[PDB]
Amino acid sequence: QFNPYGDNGGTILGIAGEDFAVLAGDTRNITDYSINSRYEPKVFDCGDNIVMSANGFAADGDALVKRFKNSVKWYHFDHNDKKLSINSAARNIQHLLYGKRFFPYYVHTIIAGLDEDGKGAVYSFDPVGSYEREQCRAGGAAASLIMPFLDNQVNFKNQYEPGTNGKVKKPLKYLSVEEVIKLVRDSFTSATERHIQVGDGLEILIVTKDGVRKEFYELKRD
Amino acid sequence: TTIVGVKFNNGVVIAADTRSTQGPIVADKNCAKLHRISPKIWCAGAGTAADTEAVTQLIGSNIELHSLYTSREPRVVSALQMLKQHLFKYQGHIGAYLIVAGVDPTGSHLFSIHAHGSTDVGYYLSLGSGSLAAMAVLESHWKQDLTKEEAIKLASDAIQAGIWNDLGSGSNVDVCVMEIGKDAEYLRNYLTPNVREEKQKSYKFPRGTTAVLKESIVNICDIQEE
Amino acid sequence: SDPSSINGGIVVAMTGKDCVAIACDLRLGSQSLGVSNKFEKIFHYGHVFLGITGLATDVTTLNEMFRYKTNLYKLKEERAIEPETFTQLVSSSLYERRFGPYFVGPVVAGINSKSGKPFIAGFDLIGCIDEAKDFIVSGTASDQLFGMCESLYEPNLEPEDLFETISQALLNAADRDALSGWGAVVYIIKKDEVVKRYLKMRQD
Amino acid sequence: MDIILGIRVQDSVILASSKAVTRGISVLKDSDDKTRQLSPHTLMSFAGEAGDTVQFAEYIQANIQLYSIREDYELSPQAVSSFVRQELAKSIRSRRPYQVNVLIGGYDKKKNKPELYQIDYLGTKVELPYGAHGYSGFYTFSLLDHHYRPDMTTEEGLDLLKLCVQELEKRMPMDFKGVIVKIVDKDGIRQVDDF
Amino acid sequence: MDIILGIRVQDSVILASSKAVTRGISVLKDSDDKTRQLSPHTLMSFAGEAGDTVQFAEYIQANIQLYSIREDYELSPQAVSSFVRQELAKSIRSRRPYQVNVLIGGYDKKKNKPELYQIDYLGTKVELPYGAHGYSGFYTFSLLDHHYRPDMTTEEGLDLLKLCVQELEKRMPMDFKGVIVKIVDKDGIRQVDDF
Amino acid sequence: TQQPIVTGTSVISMKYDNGVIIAADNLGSYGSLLRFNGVERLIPVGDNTVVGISGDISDMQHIERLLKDLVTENAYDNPLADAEEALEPSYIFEYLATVMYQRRSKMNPLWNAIIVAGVQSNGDQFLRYVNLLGVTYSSPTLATGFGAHMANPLLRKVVDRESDIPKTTVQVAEEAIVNAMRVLYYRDARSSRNFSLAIIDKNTGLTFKKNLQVENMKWDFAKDIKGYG
Amino acid sequence: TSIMAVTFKDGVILGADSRTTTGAYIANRVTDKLTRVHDKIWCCRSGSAADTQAIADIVQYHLELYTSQYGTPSTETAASVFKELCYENKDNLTAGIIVAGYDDKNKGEVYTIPLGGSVHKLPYAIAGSGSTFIYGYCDKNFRENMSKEETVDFIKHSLSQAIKWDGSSGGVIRMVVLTAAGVERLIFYPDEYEQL
Amino acid sequence: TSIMAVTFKDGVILGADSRTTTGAYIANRVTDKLTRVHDKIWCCRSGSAADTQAIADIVQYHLELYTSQYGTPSTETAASVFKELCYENKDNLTAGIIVAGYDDKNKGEVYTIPLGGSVHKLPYAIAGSGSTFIYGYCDKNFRENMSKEETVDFIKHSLSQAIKWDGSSGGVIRMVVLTAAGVERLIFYPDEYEQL
Amino acid sequence: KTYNEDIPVEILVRRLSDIKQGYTQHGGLRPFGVSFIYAGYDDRYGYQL
Amino acid sequence: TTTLAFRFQGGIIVAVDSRATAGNWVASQTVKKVIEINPFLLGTMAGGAADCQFWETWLGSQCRLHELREKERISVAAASKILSNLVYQYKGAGLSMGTMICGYTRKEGPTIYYVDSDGTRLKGDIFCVGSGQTFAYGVLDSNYKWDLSVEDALYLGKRSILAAAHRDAYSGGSVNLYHVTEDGWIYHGNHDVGELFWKVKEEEGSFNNVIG
């Protein structure tokens, strides 16, 4: 017998901003209960202010980062050094996934960058095909831990003004690039203490109108 | 779940993790895992979480009986032979894998018992999911004839091997050191690694933030009479 | 499918300083179809509060089971049962039916009258006592609850900080879970005074 | 399975059960009643697994009537429901279950109020102002949110029910040959001969 | 569902097919039909499994029609059935079958005679004075062999179909929503609706 | 549907300051039957890399042959790629991996685990893993099979993380590997007394020691093990 | 795992390894597979580990009582006790015991019980699962009636081969010697036969 | 079956057993398992009777073609022909093949090929169904570079032990002697090897 | 437990009398020498003595 | 999931929900289940998400090479009949599908088709597909009217998904309504269901079984 998909855990978090975008993930790789690697990026730059992570099962997850960058290449070659949009890349990812549908990939992809308007944009794909635009979408194994805490501090989900008791919902505001560092670092602090596939390290890529910044923080060492 | 039980010259020291899991999710950051058959017969348990706690409580019951019916100290063997017998009837439908340790008048002991009724004896045994890792560290540093101050360090570094490399294991490391004809000392929370950082902010909220539909006061008190 | 996810249900419980709070949803489904938005999963024997999640029928069976056992305790020893003593009886009743068990996951929440300490405890299917002095969560949105609850919560809260935290914790998992929500009741349990506060929340 | 709707208006519980009974490939009987009178003001309608249903409906009717002739005072709907709940609980632990879903309607003469109750095959009692079991349920719980109002009279309630039936008749691909209606109210347990 | 009937009378082929489609747990259309013209005096009603019915209806249609323009010669209903069967047999042996049952009712121009052919998903044609398919077929057969006479007029075949319909409403455990009848006469293919 | 027949196990490896040490057991099991002894599985590829292969012996031998052919394909043309612009760990590795990924597509995989460890022409330690699924991961200490729970914890005492690559000398590093082989000879049923230890230093090259014994073994404590009672 | 027992002039010498594998992970490696079930009648356990030990406790209970009421058991008696527990729960209790012992009237005797539970007397026995590699060695070079020195080497040399060819056999070689002189334990560490 | 091959100083001697079971009914009790695939490179079949024969046929077609265009093949050349067919059909076919031949420049040689195909040099090799039983006796009684007459007797003793334990090997013991002199058949009838 | 309503006074008092009757009726066991006055309440007739 | 469409006198109202669950866990609350195939066609999303999202972009590819070749705008019946034959091929590979292609042309009127994985194609006047298609039918079919205003119809589409959303586990998020006219689809925007609900509880006086 051959069981050709395993897992390597990991957890990723994509947040769309309003002048930047955040695609972050942990660097821990596992197989079962043994820690394989403490450090191992999953959040690869592809240039053009697109960051991709195809997170989950590693062997698939490296295949769609290979095949993706190969197409960044062959686009730049046959369109006279065209700048790859978020829009273009998204629909292309869709084709690359969908084409294997009799032997699917078993990863959870998320992209991030700026769109063409000077705002953040995050699209998140299921392994089969489809996609939708986001403002938060976690993925990976501790998704269900990290997502509902991000919907309560960004979108202000089910909160009302103080002492209005349901009359008027709390107003949305813009979040600074600085503030969003705190949100992502705090989620994974809480995540480590309650989940056993996350820890060691956290690598946030933050995408702006000047370049891509890697910013590395430790977590609990188990 | 990494649980070592290391025998030494003047006693036995048995140490465990404080992590209790329910599936992949960490139920409790700190929970006890060392339980007490008898005041001189400690045990820690690995395998299925309910069936660790109850089977210890139950052969716990009958030994306490038995120690008082005999007007003498309850021996390590007494416990061992009842556990053993009890587990075999259900033919390995009760999931428990206990390291049993203890002192008694007839010396220091250390046993391991499988869910059916295999029992083994070394001078160091380990059970759990951590078993593999734990065991590696022991075989390098360990020798025959270890002092107390030696023993405890060997027990601690052994569970810490467990924490780093096993994911069913984590949080604090508990110890209980037993020496023959001296009181049994429980050092819960002996060695604390993985101390939780300060959260980036408070997530406290002003009054009135959430919406109530209705309120009431409901009574927990008995009926009164004026 | 799952014998504990076929009507859903959740219970969250938190401690504070000098207070506890427990809360459940009010959903009874039969699979996909919602049948009722007014079935309790919290009950009270004395001043102890026992929230019970999992399969629909065993919530109810188990309520009348402990109703029976709590009566005989009170009658013989001439007091209302304490939280800590009761937790041991919740464990044993599950374990008696070790095979083919009650497909529940209760939560014990009280404040001891003999020491004045918040005290909470939990159980799985077979029932392993899960100590805490944080919070214990149980049910079908429990993966979400464990993350969400930990993140807001600061160790020790005031009696009405505690109403704002455990209310938000419960709302946000319950509207990201399909078998939870649909009206919810949050209790604040102080020394001698329990208030039952229904919550305005999403019905869709 | 078979239709089984309840609707509890401010002065009567209106229960309805399907006429058609299909055992084998063919409808064998087209007018069979699926109810038993427990008490003069307590009615139990059933549908479920063929041949468990007959035994469980007649078993409970023996025990409730025995209790009624004893004290000469009929038990509340509240009580009946709980005794019903209790057996179904016991039957899934036993070797072979009774898988019989029942809607209990009764007029409680002690609160002087009508009351309806739903007990599923697992044994969950729920008070509800209307309810339903099986696949029948799916088309009428939504339609009933639209027109129900708590303060309705019985004849208003009968035309609502004939609306409910009508919706089932098209959208269900299983024939039921209309309902039989039976009302439970404080003057007794009566029938309606109109569909 | 899947009910198609044939009653050959001595001047007309009377094919009637169902007005209901059921996909999933509800009826999606209760006002539908399930028949395609082959020839202007050859009519094929088809029914059976999900989604093979439409796609195999139009495949065969493209084919009979290709011949019929090309040579401006109608085919014999006899010819027509052989082709349909040839295709059905072949698909059992090929990777992907078609599970569909067809009655091809036509009026031959050459002999001036109705001919009715019943083809199963296996692909066996067999000439019948009357024929059916599915479990629906069972109820109907026993009536046709009692009351049939081979000397019938058009109206007599219509009045007979009323008995068959009346029976089906009673015994059938499922809905089917009446039938559109189609009469393959020697003048055209003319549609009437049965009551 | 793939199934190994004959199996090899356990290859352990770690980084040190100026280079890497790779070592493996050499015993070709057949389940219960310990059927071969001396089955070398440290394949030196060039002079700056050892590739240690584990798993099925059948599959291993077929990629032993691929390994020799990479060197022959590189040696056509390129008179400046003699050894100075020849193969690096990083290239050898990639080729290995992209055959195995492709075989997983097919569902007829090479059932192995492969460590590649060397030192690159950059002057940089390299230590990576690829396996039967094609999961890539780099790691400062590494094992295959059942030494991924046994050997691994013990070597993670010495070289924990990337901050301690230049604090572990080759005097510690030999010993640590030696010590794991012993703990594996105790608790693992498919390991033999024979093991091969290879040191890749960048200033003294591939020093390839073959046929070391596991020595300094304790079994005296077994004398005071009597019956259970 | 390899277990054996060989008869010789002064009585019977029992022999065992000490590795007990489960899977690929060796649980215990100093296992004492040689159990006293009376005081001159010792046994050897192989097969399903909990199910052999359970039976042995019951046999011990039978013989301790047998001694106390009726007089001392024989090799024959003890083996019989063993058989009838394996035989009557022969679907679920899976046991291969070699019952070896020194009588003061018939000397050493060996019985072998395989997994069905049928007694068979033998002048040496081998049972296990590491003893399928040394079957041809044990028969060719064995002699009935060997002196003491010879016997101890015969069982060592076989287990050395068992160790070599079977990886579920390993560690210390334990021997218990049952004779009229008494009950003497010998222990042989690995260098002492890996030397050969 | 039980097949083996064993070297000595003039060349290599191949050994076999002519029992071939289908179930417990012997299909033919004088099957010759020793096959010539090149003039001086022989092989030993075991396992499924079809399977082994089809591959020995194709190695024989490929050494017919090797020797006619590339000069005489060595033991090695022939070994890698077998390996590469067994690898490419291990999930369709099963073979055990021991390959033994004489090269002039390297004397007698023995390669073994398990079911997945791997190639392994050895100085003696054992495969078959009765091979498990004689392992430990082989490793004691084997030298190297010994007289011809001692090799003929090592094989005799080994396969008489194999017949003693295994059901599925019996009948005459064939030998093929590859030397620089030529090919000598020997055959031993049951009553000679049964004593020795 | 089974009817989710508290036991009527009539029912609980007839039940005690039946156990007592039983021992004088069958088994050869002494009767229990006890006599109770029951003070009890129910919704059905209010106070009953 | 529950997506319905009805012909009336203005065109077709399409009405969709946005709750896309993974089961117990609710994946996203903002998933669009409307797919702009061109400016005169919209396709609903039902069954496999991935399968419908892909193939109806790719129907957009066959709409634009129909349009060019014939220099005339595509028939709605022609659109449906491209898609039908595509999913017939992949039947027995087990790809799941549930789409309503909705269009309005001037040479055929409003026409809905329901394209399905089977190869099944049914035209019609009302459909609802989803894992809560049963709730939706009830309200919509009683209060059905052919002769209806644009204003009433918009409230009727909303209300139908609402009823389904309330009892259905897997329905919610937000609803989105479109009104397909001749001249194109006009978007009527995004309404939250959990916020729509309380408005409709006061005004109508429905839902007397729901707390408040």
UniProtKB/Swiss-Prot annotation, chain A:
- Which cysteines link up through disulfide bonds? none
Which GO biological-process labels does this protein carry? proteasomal ubiquitin-independent protein catabolic process; proteasome-mediated ubiquitin-dependent protein catabolic process
Compartment(s): Cytoplasm; Nucleus
| Cytoplasm recorded as keyword | yes
Q: Which UniProt keywords apply?
A: Cytoplasm, Nucleus, Proteasome
A GO cellular component annotated for this chain's UniProt record is: cytosol
- At the top level of its lineage, which domain of life is listed? Eukaryota
- Show the Pfam families listed in the entry: Proteasome (PF00227)
Q: Does Phosphoprotein appear among the keywords?
A: no
Q: Describe, as the record does, how this protein assembles with itself and its partners.
A: The 26S proteasome consists of a 20S proteasome core and two 19S regulatory subunits. The 20S proteasome core is composed of 28 subunits that are arranged in four stacked rings, resulting in a barrel-shaped structure. The two end rings are each formed by seven alpha subunits, and the two central rings are each formed by seven beta subunits. The catalytic chamber with the active sites is on the inside of the barrel.
| Family named by the database record | Belongs to the peptidase T1B family.
Question: What does the protein in this record do?
Answer: Non-catalytic component of the proteasome which degrades poly-ubiquitinated proteins in the cytoplasm and in the nucleus. It is essential for the regulated turnover of proteins and for the removal of misfolded proteins. The proteasome is a multicatalytic proteinase complex that is characterized by its ability to cleave peptides with Arg, Phe, Tyr, Leu, and Glu adjacent to the leaving group at neutral or slightly basic pH. It has an ATP-dependent proteolytic activity.
Put simply, this protein is called Proteasome subunit beta type-6
What lineage, starting at the top, does this entry show?
Eukaryota, Fungi, Dikarya, Ascomycota, Saccharomycotina
From Swiss-Prot, chain C:
Q: Which residues carry this modification: Phosphoserine?
A: 30
Q: Where is this cross-link: Glycyl lysine isopeptide (Lys-Gly) (interchain with G-Cter in ubiquitin)?
A: 69
The compartments listed are: Cytoplasm; Nucleus
- Family annotation (InterPro entries): Ntn_hydrolases_N, Proteasome_beta_3, Proteasome_bsu_CS, Proteasome_sua/b, Proteasome_suB-type
Name the GO terms of the biological process aspect.
Answer: proteasomal ubiquitin-independent protein catabolic process; proteasome-mediated ubiquitin-dependent protein catabolic process
GO cellular component, as recorded: cytosol; nucleus; proteasome complex; proteasome core complex, beta-subunit complex
Q: What does the UniProt function comment say about this protein?
A: Non-catalytic component of the proteasome which degrades poly-ubiquitinated proteins in the cytoplasm and in the nucleus. It is essential for the regulated turnover of proteins and for the removal of misfolded proteins. The proteasome is a multicatalytic proteinase complex that is characterized by its ability to cleave peptides with Arg, Phe, Tyr, Leu, and Glu adjacent to the leaving group at neutral or slightly basic pH. It has an ATP-dependent proteolytic activity. This subunit may participate in the trypsin-like activity of the enzyme complex.
Q: What protein am I looking at?
A: Proteasome subunit beta type-3
- Tell me what organism the protein belongs to: Saccharomyces cerevisiae (strain ATCC 204508 / S288c)
Swiss-Prot record, chains D, E:
Q: Name one GO cellular component term.
A: proteasome complex
Where can this protein be found? Cytoplasm; Nucleus
An example of a GO molecular function for this protein is: endopeptidase activator activity
Q: How does it assemble?
A: The 26S proteasome consists of a 20S proteasome core and two 19S regulatory subunits. The 20S proteasome core is composed of 28 subunits that are arranged in four stacked rings, resulting in a barrel-shaped structure. The two end rings are each formed by seven alpha subunits, and the two central rings are each formed by seven beta subunits. The catalytic chamber with the active sites is on the inside of the barrel.
- GO annotation terms (biological process): proteasomal ubiquitin-independent protein catabolic process; proteasome-mediated ubiquitin-dependent protein catabolic process
**Record-given protein name:** Proteasome subunit beta type-4
Q: Which family does it belong to?
A: Belongs to the peptidase T1B family.
Where would you say this protein principally sits, based on its record?
cytoplasm
Q: Which InterPro entries match?
A: Ntn_hydrolases_N, Proteasome_beta2, Proteasome_bsu_CS, Proteasome_sua/b, Proteasome_suB-type
Q: Which organism is it from?
A: Saccharomyces cerevisiae (strain ATCC 204508 / S288c) (Baker's yeast)
Keyword set, alphabetical order:
Acetylation, Cytoplasm, Nucleus, Phosphoprotein, Proteasome
Positions modified as Phosphoserine?
76
Give the note: Present with 21800 molecules/cell in log phase SD medium.
- Top-rank taxon: Eukaryota
N-acetylmethionine PTM sites in chain numbering: 1
Its ancestry begins with: Eukaryota, Fungi, Dikarya, Ascomycota, Saccharomycotina
Curated annotation (Swiss-Prot), chain J:
Protein family: Belongs to the peptidase T1B family.
Residues of the active site are 1
Q: GO molecular function of the protein, one example?
A: threonine-type endopeptidase activity
Which parts of the chain span the membrane according to its record? none
Q: What catalytic activity does the UniProt entry give for this protein?
A: Cleavage of peptide bonds with very broad specificity
Parent-record interval covered? 76 to 287 of 287
In this chain, bortezomib is annotated as bound at 49
Note from the entry: The side chain of Thr-1 acts as a nucleophile, and the N-terminal amino group acts as a proton acceptor.
Q: What job does this protein perform?
A: The proteasome degrades poly-ubiquitinated proteins in the cytoplasm and in the nucleus. It is essential for the regulated turnover of proteins and for the removal of misfolded proteins. The proteasome is a multicatalytic proteinase complex that is characterized by its ability to cleave peptides with Arg, Phe, Tyr, Leu, and Glu adjacent to the leaving group at neutral or slightly basic pH. It has an ATP-dependent proteolytic activity. This unit is responsible of the chymotrypsin-like activity of the proteasome and is one of the principal target of the proteasome inhibitor bortezomib.
What is the protein's name according to its record? Proteasome subunit beta type-5
UniProt keyword annotations, A-Z: Cytoplasm, Hydrolase, Nucleus, Protease, Proteasome, Threonine protease, Zymogen
**What EC designation does it have?**
3.4.25.1
Q: Per the UniProt entry, what species is this protein from, by scientific name?
A: Saccharomyces cerevisiae (strain ATCC 204508 / S288c)
Taxon lineage: Eukaryota, Fungi, Dikarya, Ascomycota, Saccharomycotina
Q: Which domain of life is it from?
A: Eukaryota
Which BP terms does GO give this entry?
proteasomal ubiquitin-independent protein catabolic process; proteasome core complex assembly; proteasome-mediated ubiquitin-dependent protein catabolic process
